[PDB]
């Protein structure tokens, strides 16, 4: 499972608009636990693609 820092870097490196990136990062801080972080990463992939 990717760490919180890796997931943040992925958001930052994506081509999404800045406000979209900022809101995703805000949501990330509310995620708690390895399981939810993994689910976060999965949904994030669908948005990035």
């Amino acid at each position: 499972g990717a760490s919180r820092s890796v997931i943040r870097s992925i958001i930052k490196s994506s081509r999404l608009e800045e406000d979209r990136k900022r809101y995703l990062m805000t949501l990330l801080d509310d995620i708690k636990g390895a399981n939810d972080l993994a689910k976060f990463h999965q949904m994030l992939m669908k948005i990035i693609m």
Binding site: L24, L27, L28, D30, I31, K32, D36, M43, K46, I47
Partner: peptide
């Protein structure tokens, strides 16, 4: 409360992904 907040964040994320 921490888990519920996390669950809600995932729901908000899901809505952005249009899932």
């Amino acid at each position: 409360q921490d888990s519920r907040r996390s669950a809600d964040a995932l729901l908000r994320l899901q809505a952005m992904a249009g899932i």
